[PDB]
Design a protein around this nucleic acid. Structure first.
Ligand SMILES: [Zn+2]
Ligand SMILES: [Zn+2]
Lengths: 112, 117, 365, 144, 165
DNA sequence: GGCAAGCTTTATTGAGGCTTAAGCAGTGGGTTCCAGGTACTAGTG
DNA sequence: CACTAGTACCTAGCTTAAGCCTCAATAAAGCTTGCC
């Protein structure tokens, strides 16, 4: 380029389209999930969704282009899944471990 | 005691909620979307294990015997099938990994038995 | 997230190199050309909005202006300001030594900014084994951030996932739009490039089949990686462009597949036309990336680790080709670098880029 | 076998890590002393150490006898992979060689896993040296 | 500095402690004390354990083993069918919390001390019946004295958190 | 039946909880970029 | 007489104060009934 020899240095990044669970130990969130979702051969950039449990035990979601902490159950109802049983089918795949159902119970009882 | 599961409606298939009977002095599960009632099974509606005494063998699956990176032994035979070889590993979990407890999984096909030493 | 809040699955590391990708010149120039091709379309739309409202017909050779698609590439490569954002992407090539020229073409940049008091993006993580040199790093204020690739490590240029999805639908994989949510937890969730494509019931003889196709290059490219998570019932296949793999030998029961006949056909190159790629095709070596190194049992050297002893594991899957291939290009010119101390190896990796020497053969031109 | 009993004040795992670090530090010290009883008074390492001009007894112990336990953040080499340190080791391997103890010396040279664990400890030292400078200079500036 | 594998009190000497002294930090990384014992308690490990328990912040969560709430409208015949139910002879939902013997031994606590701290912290709104030293099962049964049912769960969370035993 | 010591309301006023600049070790050597876009006229076809 | 060119003019984390948001005693303001 203009007689000058240029080298494109390979740049690291977090792997896209992959769910990660991190701990913001300083924030108000106990455990925060994320997924830097980016479709291959798409001109638009990546758009990170966050799914984070509150530290106090509700679970919320930070969506792209939405500035408030939307609850999870609001998003599942917004996808056309009205029953709590159906949402709990998509979240917890066994109905024989009552501990995980008891943990998702306050987040389910936020948005009845 | 034991854990408590989420009860479900029959009509709208939402979550049932505990409430009292002012008349018969009994607990009834009642929805909030529709108006459906059920007789309770137990008095225990909430539970909270805080000392966290969990049965770790339930979280162990049998398919982890197929892992090559787990260490094997011919020192401990399986109690069920008598197969002499078994893999052994730690707890692999949080709220754990303060004690170094071995869990054994028999690597024999179509038995899949796991136990604690 | 619920499994992390239980601890039934451990938390995720930001520095594990199965969790990272390397944007090379392909994805970088693609990311640049997206914006610049979109801006050329925007300028063609502005020209057409000007010349329809006069009622006339536009002139299409004047519609597409060439400076917005060529001067932008020339600016982003000549300056390094990667945009109209970040900087330092295209550096001027270092031509003091041929070792410095090679080491500048094999350099990775962590996007983490400088002058940070934390240590975890800078440290030598465990999953830098064999993919990136442990010794070579700039010992100034960019320790560990700027790295130099190892020798035999190779960045997967990525292919399309569609033959893998056709192969999975060929076998008895059940798609998400046709399942009951009751048979999900007694079977293994299968992912392609992150997106969850369905369920499969028998994870063994699926992984054996996918590996059997990769040791033959029937459908699946050699770069594509399968990972069977065994503790949690998952199986994920990555076909991304940017993962970092390195070739390893393949060990059946307790024996290498690199037989004497491969060495006999491989000594007589330029005659038999028997290349490296014929040995990848023979199902003897294969590229393992960093995710799949978490699920591999890797022999260091065969002369120690397939002979019966008081047995360590006796369940090896791969064997390292040679341990000296964990080193970079500047840490490869050090004689006996295991006898040194490791800061001395790092300092020589710095100085070897600065030694005078015949840097190129056509230096008189 | 749960026959290890916990020291009062910490977990069973930290009790275990104290036992393992105590044995390996005793090994490093005993091999270091048994190396440095054998210089025969003309050894130039001893000539520079006894004068105190350059080096110490630790450098003699690491050149002749044993490099010793490699550390990252004051503890052993962590499990960067799933429950193993390098993919050459079996999972849940808390032994000496799996967790970063180097039994070779710089005269014999390190095996590649010991080379990589040694490179980790050295990277920790260089990170310390490179991050220390700005903060110490700013403390000096504020004090003056 | 190498470090101590045993407790080691996060002393962080060096550059950051020098920083915390140079700029007067109201949030130091590791605040501490050095509590010198006065008399015979300085030369006795048991009296020093007593001072150690009288200084350390002991909530109810560090002492409890598990807890549950129940719906027993007849306290004279509970669903658990334990012994001390005749101590009674008002609300039909109760708080059944079971303590371990180990932390009750180590903190040098009794049942009556915990019940007295709960009665002092909660007034006469709450009723606590404890267990004697008959079994290892250390039972506290807590009832509301006279929002509806989840208020007992709210004060369960507000009792595990900050009772300051 | 009117003031007055006390109760009730009502500002009220001092005392605990949330966003935001502003600092962040030093000394040399190379590269690149700082005006583009219209307007108005002259020369050439 | 028309087109185009040349050139001349127009437009990563920290920490700590520091301002800003809400909550509990408290004295004036006015009822309130208790005593004269
Ligand atoms: Zn219902
Ligand atoms: Zn068995």
């Amino acid at each position: 380029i203009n007689g000058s020899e240029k080298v494109l240095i390979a740049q690291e990044k977090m792997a896209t389209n992959t769910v990660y669970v991190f701990a913001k130990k300083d924030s108000k969130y106990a455990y925060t999930g994320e997924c830097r979702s980016c479709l291959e051969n798409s001109s638009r950039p990546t758009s990170t969704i966050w799914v984070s449990m509150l530290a106090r035990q509700r679970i919320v979601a930070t969506l792209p282009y939405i500035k408030q902490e939307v609850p999870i159950i609001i998003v599942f109802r917004a996808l056309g899944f009205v029953s709590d049983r159906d949402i709990l089918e998509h979240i917890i795949y066994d109905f024989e471990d009552p501990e995980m159902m008891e943990m998702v119970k306050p987040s389910l009882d936020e948005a009845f | 005691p034991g854990f408590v599961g989420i009860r479900f409606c029959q009509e709208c298939n939402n979550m049932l909620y505990p409430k009292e009977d002012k008349e018969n002095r009994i607990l009834l599960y009642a929805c909030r979307n529709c108006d459906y009632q059920q007789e309770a099974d137990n008095s225990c509606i909430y539970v909270n294990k805080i000392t966290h005494e969990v049965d770790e063998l339930t979280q162990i699956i049998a398919d982890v015997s197929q892992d090559p990176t787990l260490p094997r032994t011919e020192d401990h035979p399986c109690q069920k099938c008598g197969h002499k070889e078994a893999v052994f590993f730690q707890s692999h979990s949080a709220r754990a990994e303060d004690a170094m407890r071995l869990y054994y999984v028999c690597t024999a096909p179509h038995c899949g038995h796991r136990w604690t030493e | 997230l619920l499994l992390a809040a239980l601890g039934r699955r451990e938390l995720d590391d930001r520095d594990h190199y199965g969790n990272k990708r390397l944007d090379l010149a392909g994805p970088l120039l693609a990311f640049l050309f997206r914006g610049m091709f979109k801006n050329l379309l925007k300028e063609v739309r502005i020209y057409a909005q000007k010349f329809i409202d006069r009622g006339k017909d536009f002139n299409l050779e004047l519609a597409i202006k060439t400076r917005i698609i060529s001067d932008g590439l020339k600016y982003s490569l000549a300056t390094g300001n990667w945009g109209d954002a970040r900087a330092g992407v295209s550096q001027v090539l270092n031509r003091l030594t041929f070792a410095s020229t090679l080491s500048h073409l094999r350099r990775l940049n962590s996007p983490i900014g400088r002058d940070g008091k934390l240590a975890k993006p800078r440290q030598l993580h465990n999953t830098l084994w064999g993919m990136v040199c442990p010794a070579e790093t700039p010992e100034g204020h960019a320790v560990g951030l700027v790295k130099n690739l190892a020798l035999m490590a190779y960045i997967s240029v990525g292919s399309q996932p569609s033959p893998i999805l056709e192969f999975l639908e060929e076998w008895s994989m059940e798609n998400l739009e046709e399942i009951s949510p009751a048979a999900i937890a007694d079977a293994t969730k299968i992912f392609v490039n992150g997106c969850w494509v369905g369920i499969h019931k028998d994870p063994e003889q699926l992984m054996n089949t996918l590996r059997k196709l990769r040791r033959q290059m029937d459908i699946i490219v050699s770069e594509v990686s399968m990972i069977r998570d065994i503790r949690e019932r998952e199986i994920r296949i990555y076909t991304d462009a940017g993962r970092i793999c390195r070739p390893l030998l393949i060990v059946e029961k307790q024996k290498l597949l690199l037989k004497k006949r491969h060495i006999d056909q491989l000594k007589e190159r330029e005659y038999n036309n028997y290349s490296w790629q014929d040995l990848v095709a023979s199902g003897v070596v294969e590229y393992i990336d960093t995710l799949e190194e978490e699920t591999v049992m890797l022999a260091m050297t065969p002369d120690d680790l397939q002979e019966k002893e008081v047995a360590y594991c006796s369940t090896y899957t791969h064997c390292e080709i040679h341990p000296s291939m964990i080193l970079g290009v500047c840490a490869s010119i050090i004689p006996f670098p295991d006898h040194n101390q490791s800061p001395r190896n790092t300092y020589q990796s710095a100085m070897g880029k600065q030694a005078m020497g015949v840097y190129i053969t056509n230096f008189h031109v | 076998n749960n026959e290890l009993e916990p020291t009062p004040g910490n977990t069973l795992r930290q009790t275990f890590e104290n036992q393992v670090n105590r044995i390996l530090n005793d090994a490093r010290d005993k091999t270091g002393s048994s190396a440095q009883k054998s210089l025969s008074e003309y050894n130039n390492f001893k000539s520079m150490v006894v004068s105190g001009a350059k080096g110490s007894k630790i450098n003699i112990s690491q050149v002749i006898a044993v490099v010793g336990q490699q550390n990252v953040e004051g503890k052993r080499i962590p499990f960067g992979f799933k429950h193993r340190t390098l993919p050459h080791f079996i999972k849940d391997d808390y032994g000496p060689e799996s967790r970063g103890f180097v039994e070779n010396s710089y005269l014999a040279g390190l095996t590649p896993t010991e080379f990589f664990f040694h490179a980790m400890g050295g990277r920790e030292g260089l990170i310390d040296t490179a991050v220390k400078t700005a903060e110490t200079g700013y403390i000096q500036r504020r004090l003056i | 500095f190498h470090y101590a594998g045993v407790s080691a009190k996060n002393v962080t000497l060096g550059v950051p402690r020098l920083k915390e002294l140079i700029n007067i930090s109201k949030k130091p990384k590791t605040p501490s004390l050095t509590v010198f014992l006065l008399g015979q308690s300085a030369r006795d490990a048991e009296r020093a354990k007593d001072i150690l328990c009288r200084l350390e912040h002991t909530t109810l969560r560090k002492v409890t083993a598990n807890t549950a709430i129940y719906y027993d409208p007849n306290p004279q015949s509970t669903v658990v069918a334990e012994d001390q139910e005749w101590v009674n002879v008002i609300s039909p939902w109760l708080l059944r919390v079971e303590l371990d013997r180990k932390h009750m031994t180590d903190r040098k606590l009794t049942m009556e001390q915990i019940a007295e701290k709960i009665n002092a912290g909660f007034g006469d709104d709450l009723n606590c019946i404890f267990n004697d030293d008959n079994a290892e099962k250390l039972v506290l049964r807590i009832r509301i004295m006279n929002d509806d049912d989840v208020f007992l769960r709210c004060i369960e969370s507000n009792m595990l958190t900050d009772m300051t035993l």
